[PDB]
C-alpha cells in the first residue's frame, strides 16, 4: 500500500474535510438535481475513505450517513451540523472518517486530488490480476469524481480554468483503463519509471505494447498542480516571481517516499 509520511496524513485529513464539507451542503440543496449529484459524490468519496481503512466500502453504513445529511437540519450554524455529524458518524462506527482539522483552504482541494491520485496508483499496483473487474470499476468512479470537483470555496476563475483543463487528468485515468484492459486480454502491464518511456511506448502502430509509468497519477496530478500555478501568472499579467518555486518529480516522490 501507500507509504506513511507526514504529507500523506495531511492529504488523508484534508480529504475527509473535503468530504464533510460536501455532505454539509446536502442540507441546503434547494434543487432535486443537485441533491442527487451531491449524494453520488459523497457516497463515492467515503467509499474510497473506508476502502483504504476498513478494506470495505461499507455501502449500507455510508448510505445511512447520506440519508442523514440530506434529512439534516437545513438551518445550522457551522458547528450546528458538525456536532451531530460526530454524533451520527459514531453510531455507524465511522469515526475514522471524521476530519481532525477543519480549516478549509485551497490546499484542502489540492490535497484531495493528490489523495485520490495516490489511491489510483495504489489500487493499480496492488491489483490482483483476476479481479481487474474491481479496479477498472473504481477508475470509472474516479473519473466521475475528478469531473465534478466542487470548489465549496468561491473562486470563479479557478472553477472555469479547471472545467477547461481537467480532461488532462481524466485522460491519464483512461490510459490506465486501456492498460488494465490490455492485461485482461493477455498483455501484462510493463511498469516504467519515466513518463517519457510511457510516451515513447504509446507511439506504436499496433495494440500489443503495454507500458505504464509507475505512480502515473501522482506525477499527472503534480504536473497539473504546477500547471495551474504556472498559468495564474498569465491570468494576473505578471512575470512569475522569484519566490515562485515549482514542484519537481524527484522532490515530490521524496516527500511522499515513493519508489
Ligand X SMILES: Cc1cc2nc3c(=O)[nH]c(=O)nc-3n(C[C@H](O)[C@H](O)[C@H](O)COP(=O)(O)OP(=O)(O)OC[C@H]3O[C@@H](n4cnc5c(N)ncnc54)[C@H](O)[C@@H]3O)c2cc1C
Instruction: Pull the grid cell for residue 130.
Output: 483476476
SS3 content of the chain, % helix, strand, coil (to 5): 65, 0, 30
Provide CB contacts within 8 A for 98, sequence distance 6+: 16, 20, 85, 86, 89
Q: How far is the CB of 250 from ligand X (least distance, A)?
A: 12
- Read off the DSSP letter of residue 211: E
Q: How far is the CB of 165 from ligand X (least distance, A)?
A: 9
Is 243 among the residues that bind a copy of itself (CB under 8 A)? no
Is 109 among the residues that bind ligand X (CB under 6 A)? yes
Q: Closer to a copy of itself by CB, 47 or 232: give it.
A: 232
Is 165 among the residues that bind a copy of itself (CB under 8 A)? yes
CA-CA distances (angstroms) from residue 69 to 22, 89, 217?
A: 10, 11, 31
Is 125 among the residues that bind a copy of itself (CB under 8 A)? no
Q: CA–CA separation, 83 vs 45, rounded Å?
A: 21
Q: Closer to ligand X by CB, 81 or 146: give it.
A: 146
Is 195 among the residues that bind a copy of itself (CB under 8 A)? yes
Q: Which of 74, 171, 188, 257 binds a copy of itself (CB under 8 A)?
A: 171
Q: Which of 131, 204, 255, 257 binds a copy of itself (CB under 8 A)?
A: 204
Q: Closer to a copy of itself by CB, 78 or 205: give it.
A: 205
Given ligand X, a copy of itself, none, residue 96, with its beta carbon under 5 to 8 Å by kind, binds none
Q: Which parts of 25-44 interact with ligand X (CB under 6 A)?
A: none
Neighbours of 91 (CB within 10 A): 12
Determine whether 197 is exposed, middle or buried from the number of CB atoms within 10 Å of its CB (0-12, 13-18, 19+). middle
Amino acid at each position: 500500500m501507500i507509504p506513511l509520511t507526514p504529507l500523506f496524513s495531511r492529504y488523508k485529513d484534508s480529504y475527509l474535510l473535503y468530504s464533510f464539507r460536501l455532505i454539509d451542503l446536502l442540507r441546503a440543496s434547494k434543487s432535486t438535481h443537485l441533491t442527487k449529484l451531491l449524494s453520488s459524490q459523497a457516497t463515492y468519496l467515503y467509499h474510497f475513505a473506508c476502502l483504504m481503512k476498513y478494506k470495505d466500502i461499507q455501502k449500507y453504513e455510508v448510505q445511512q450517513l447520506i440519508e442523514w445529511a440530506i434529512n439534516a437540519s437545513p438551518d445550522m450554524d457551522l458547528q450546528q451540523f458538525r456536532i451531530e455529524f460526530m454524533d451520527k458518524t459514531t453510531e455507524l462506527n465511522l469515526r475514522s472518517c471524521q476530519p481532525k482539522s477543519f480549516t478549509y483552504t485551497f490546499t484542502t482541494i489540492w490535497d484531495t486530488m493528490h489523495f485520490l491520485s495516490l489511491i489510483i496508483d495504489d489500487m493499480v499496483y496492488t491489483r490482483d490480476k483476476s479481479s481487474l473487474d474491481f479496479v477498472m470499476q473504481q477508475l470509472k468512479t474516479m473519473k466521475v469524481l475528478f469531473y465534478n470537483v466542487f470548489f465549496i470555496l468561491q473562486c470563479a476563475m479557478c472553477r472555469d480554468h479547471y472545467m477547461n483543463v481537467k480532461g488532462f487528468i481524466i485522460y491519464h485515468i483512461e490510459l490506465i483503463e486501456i492498460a488494465l484492459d490490455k492485461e485482461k486480454y493477455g498483455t501484462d502491464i510493463t511498469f516504467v519509471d519515466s513518463y517519457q518511456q510511457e510516451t515513447a511506448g504509446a507511439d506504436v502502430a499496433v495494440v500489443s505494447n503495454n507500458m505504464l509509468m509507475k505512480n502515473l497519477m501522482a506525477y499527472v496530478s503534480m504536473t497539473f498542480h504546477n500547471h495551474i500555478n504556472d498559468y495564474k501568472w498569465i491570468q494576473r499579467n505578471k512575470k512569475p516571481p522569484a519566490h515562485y518555486e515549482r514542484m519537481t518529480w524527484g522532490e515530490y516522490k521524496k516527500l511522499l517516499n515513493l519508489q
